[PDB]
Amino acid sequence: KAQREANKKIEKQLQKDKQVYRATHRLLLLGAGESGKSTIVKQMRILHVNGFNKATKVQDIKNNLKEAIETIVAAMSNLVPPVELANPENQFRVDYILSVMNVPDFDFPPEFYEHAKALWEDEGVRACYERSNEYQLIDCAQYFLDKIDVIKQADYVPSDQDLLRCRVLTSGIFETKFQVDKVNFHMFDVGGQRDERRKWIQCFNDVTAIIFVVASSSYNMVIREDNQTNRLQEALNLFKSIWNNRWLRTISVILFLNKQDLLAEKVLAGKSKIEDYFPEFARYTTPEDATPEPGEDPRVTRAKYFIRDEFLRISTASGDGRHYCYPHFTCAVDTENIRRVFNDCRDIIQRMHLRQYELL
Ligand SMILES: Nc1nc2c(ncn2[C@@H]2O[C@H](COP(=O)(O)OP(=O)(O)NP(=O)(O)O)[C@@H](O)[C@H]2O)c(=O)[nH]1
Ligand SMILES: [Cl-]
Ligand SMILES: [Mg+2]
């Protein structure tokens, strides 16, 4: 008697578990390396779980800080033409920083912060930083190098922005579950460098939607994997691969044209011309229905819409009735931007999942 009763209790439990799964939106974050996928996940935690509640991440921030200064300083003599210190008295600091580049488990002594700060204030170091698209530099370099004095304090506690800016590699598949207004979301974060893309197929089962993230600002950079392929070209080629992939033909794509702040900054700097990398930009005109933010520099508007339209040219070329691409301009480190963008996705995501039920 109690045997059949335990049994269909398990079975009522099983049926509830099936309905939870069916109604949970599985969101797969795809995009090339450093496009911003893990930062989007961190924002979902800030907005909808408990964020980072931090002391675990202090070493990661210090490692980013160290990677940034040592990368810039190492690049100075390797650029063509090389970049010289503005104050050649700083050479002994260059020597120190380069000498500790590959020490595992670095102990971050006070001289490290002293030398890093002095070098970061050197106009030559800064001129090398301004050429960083000629080498490989983490995006958070300026943010952390500007607060060396904060990070080095013994009582340093990272802010939420520090944790968002912190770059770590994503080796493997990382899941994050969260609930917004009793709707359940299940986000899958994966690495986006080329070798990590072999893992992506493991997540294609029962996907509700893809969030495809692009570093819009990286149009003048090349990928780490071969130090030759343009990063935006790689993003486009990768998006075409996803849009047309055998397993993902039914799956709609929310396209996050991310790093809008860095793109704005690169446009305003005026050094790196998009048409030097994408010659067709010279003939591109901002669309009639563009909606620039008040005061946005029209050069920025034209840039960001050109990049959007390079992706939409791919997504409009196939799939017309079977899946759709929803573009959004994003700044993944801006919590209020991601709050607004994600809220504007919740209705379309619910609709994607409902249509999936009729197809099954
Ligand atoms: N200023 C700015 N920084 C951004 C933005 N999106 C990401 N970043 C920064 O760019 C770096 C890379 O971001 P991350 O989320 O780790 O990229 P990813 O796509 O997960 N990289 P991977 O594929 O290797 O896992 C981080 O330092 C992150 O803070 C953005 O919109 N604006
Ligand atoms: Cl990218
Ligand atoms: Mg990542």
Residue numbers in the entry: 17 to 69, 88 to 394
What did the published study say regarding this structure?
To elucidate how GN13 binds to Gαs and inhibits Gαs-mediated AC activation, we solved a co-crystal structure of the GppNHp-bound short isoform Gαs/GN13 complex. The structure was determined by molecular replacement and refined to 1.57 Å. GN13 assumes a highly ordered structure through extensive hydrogen bonding networks with three well-defined water molecules. The side chains of GN13 I8 and W9 (IW motif) dock into two Gαs hydrophobic pockets. Finally, the I8A and W9A mutants of GN13 completely abolished GN13 binding, underscoring the importance of the hydrophobic IW motif. The Gαs/GNP/GN13 structure strongly resembles the Gαs/GTPγS structure, suggesting that GN13 recognizes the active conformation and does not induce significant conformational change upon binding. GN13 binds to Gαs/GNP with a KD value of 0.19 ± 0.02 μM. The active-state inhibitor, cpGN13 inhibits cAMP production in cells by directly competing with the Gαs effector, AC.
The G protein-coupled receptor cascade leading to production of the second messenger cAMP is replete with pharmacologically targetable proteins, with the exception of the Gα subunit, Gαs. We identified two macrocyclic peptides, GN13 and GD20, that antagonize the active and inactive states of Gαs, respectively. To increase the probability of selecting function-perturbing hits, we took advantage of the fact that when Gαs switches from the GDP-bound inactive state to the GTP-bound active state, significant conformational changes occur at the switch I, II, and III regions, which are known to bind protein partners such as Gβγ or adenylyl cyclases (AC).
